[PDB]
Design a protein around this ligand. Sequence first.
Ligand SMILES: [Zn+2]
Lengths: 534, 220, 110
Amino acid sequence: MFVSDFRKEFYEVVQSQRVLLFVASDVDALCACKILQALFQCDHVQYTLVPVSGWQELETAFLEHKEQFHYFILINCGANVDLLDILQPDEDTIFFVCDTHRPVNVVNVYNDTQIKLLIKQDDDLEVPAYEDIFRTMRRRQRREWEARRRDILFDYEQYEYHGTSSAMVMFELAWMLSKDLNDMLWWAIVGLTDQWVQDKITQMKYVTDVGVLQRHVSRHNHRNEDEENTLSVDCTRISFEYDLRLVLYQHWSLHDSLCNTSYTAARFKLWSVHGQKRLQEFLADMGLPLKQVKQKFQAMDISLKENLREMIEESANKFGMKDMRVQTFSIHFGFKHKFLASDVVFATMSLMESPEKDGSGTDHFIQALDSLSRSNLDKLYHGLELAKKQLRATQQTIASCLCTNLVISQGPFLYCSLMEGTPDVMLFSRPASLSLLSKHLLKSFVCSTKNRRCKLLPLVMAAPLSMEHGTVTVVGIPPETDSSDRKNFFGRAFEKAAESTSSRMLHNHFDLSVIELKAEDRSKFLDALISLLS
Amino acid sequence: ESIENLEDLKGHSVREWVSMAGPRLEIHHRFKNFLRTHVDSHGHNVFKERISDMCKENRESLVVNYEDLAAREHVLAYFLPEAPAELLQIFDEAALEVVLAMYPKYDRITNHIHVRISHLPLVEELRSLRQLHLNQLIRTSGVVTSCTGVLPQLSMVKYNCNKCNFVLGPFCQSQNQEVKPGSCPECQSAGPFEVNMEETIYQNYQRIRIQESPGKVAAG
Amino acid sequence: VDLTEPIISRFDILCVVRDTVDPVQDEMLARFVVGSHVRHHPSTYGVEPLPQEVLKKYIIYAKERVHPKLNQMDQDKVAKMYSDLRKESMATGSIPITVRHIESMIRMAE
Ligand SMILES: [Zn+2]
């Protein structure tokens, strides 16, 4: 069932109870977890928090914890599968699901007693009616009904996508509880910006949600400040910004940010030998000295920093980059700490997807989660350093793939693969960073090629996972277009291709468009996908 | 305004002629037009490409080929070896305001651009230099034997008055003698003065010694 | 050769040229030399060269605007090659000192 009011029939229920949080390892999940943590700590709710990153891990943790806890909250996981089938719970347990994944599984939708969904009912949802999904001429009519059922269920389950941010949902709950702090609002903003950075949502939906959060920012600012008398410099001040699309440009030199932003790198073809000259054309059009552009931004001359955004916008317009400016937010506190929401997103993501072989992925999750609090600001800066390394490695990998021409058409989709032992393949072994790399690589490819048909294709990308088990991760990306809905069918396509091939596919990740394959299975699996997409 | 002319006929000397306002403006316009209209044998606008390749790298120095300057503008090639300092100053100004037409924000990068002449056909052996070549543009070849370090030389110097706060206005430094104020216009104290080290404009300086290449003519 | 191993091994490429008699090859070489002498009066190729101005531009472009990267070169093949090259050299008279010849091959591939 959908929860109609989070306050009464979710929060006031669990407020009297011991709770278990399962949280996915993504930045939106981390922000929603932080908001809910702060609420529970205000109300002395005895919660336990468990990270998870796949179905096997969630099943293991639930089997470990099922006896002691009756109330469970799943953040950014569980909505798009039958939780009762997967977990096999006792009937007295209750699962709250604040998950952005769409479409919601019909069993979770119509299970009234046990599965409760912390999902907005005014999100883009098209759930089929109950009578269409659940129960001689009567036999013929029944078989016709079953044919209708399979057709409508395939139409419902074909495309997966993402709804409103879980962090935004939790901040809505905090606002209804009248316990919303400025830091909670910042976590909500970072949660939305995670979806925008990873291209999980459309630009229109992102603009709408930014319009929602603008009102909350204005309310929080005018809560205790006006234009006549102001707060201490120590206090956090969140400001709406119509800022630049360039990544981490306030902590870098502008040259590095123009080099490693996927947008500008794809436009100017900076992987190519000619791309640096095109970048120099752009910089000379702006009139910025190269010794200033290659200097760190905080050390750049303030005469140049005065109107840099207008300069970059108006040069980008005539160079063909039509949407260089983006609606976003920034947070200021103290004298010297200034971050964009995209900066916090990249830092936390790099901490979580860090390639270091220390401890465990749960350890990297813990470092990422700690970095979202201002008492652990050093972790945030360290995450920014890791983001520098990650973005440089991303551009190196894209340059390698395009120069050696690993990205190759195979009919209805482009195909690419990373070989073992190549530079910085370890950084993209993990599925989430691989999905991000595939998106950036597809943007670079469609900006590079002259073939108008190839600009319309989706991308399938693979990389090694475990040589000892002989497995590869595989991800599927929809076509990269300006007006895409960011819906993709590769979940069901992978499932149906694997079933039609009897392939050894482990479906452990929460996105259905991310899978693990036994490596030798890839040839017949790819052939099946080619025959399927046709 | 000052009217355009036939340039090559005059009663003055060449230096005096190109110093006068009318022909100076005509020379300026001619070199501007030459930069903005010269083309390659294949029809490529040469100096648009060269100015773009300069402004990309911020090199603030434009190389011009005599062998096509003579092709496009005859009289400029005529006056250039005869009055090089004056004509090169005029070329610098014209090139600067061409570059600020192509890249209007380039004054943020540099306030002055030097025109450098290449492939000058009146080449001279280094030991064959005579009084006949004085104050004329020459081309020579040789091996560099010595170099000073890169040193700052005064170019536009403002002097603090020896007894009060006043800055005596800019003097254009020469390569022949250290220019001096004599006495201050606000109060006629005289003799020694202090350079305003902050407001004075300096330029890079480097003096090299070149001699004939060992294998060219020095046969013992 | 009369050179020692520390100086020989520093040369990545060793070249030997011999003026051995072979009358057909001598005819071809002599005809080419006479052709050069008559061609350049003051007044094995089969592919035609580039003009030397084009070659100078090509070299100076390639040495600055191109930086070849190495990502995979069939490591076991090169290692096996180097190992039995060392084995054969131990019995005879030229000196693949351990890493310099491996790195010579890497440099030549680049
Ligand atoms: Zn005085």
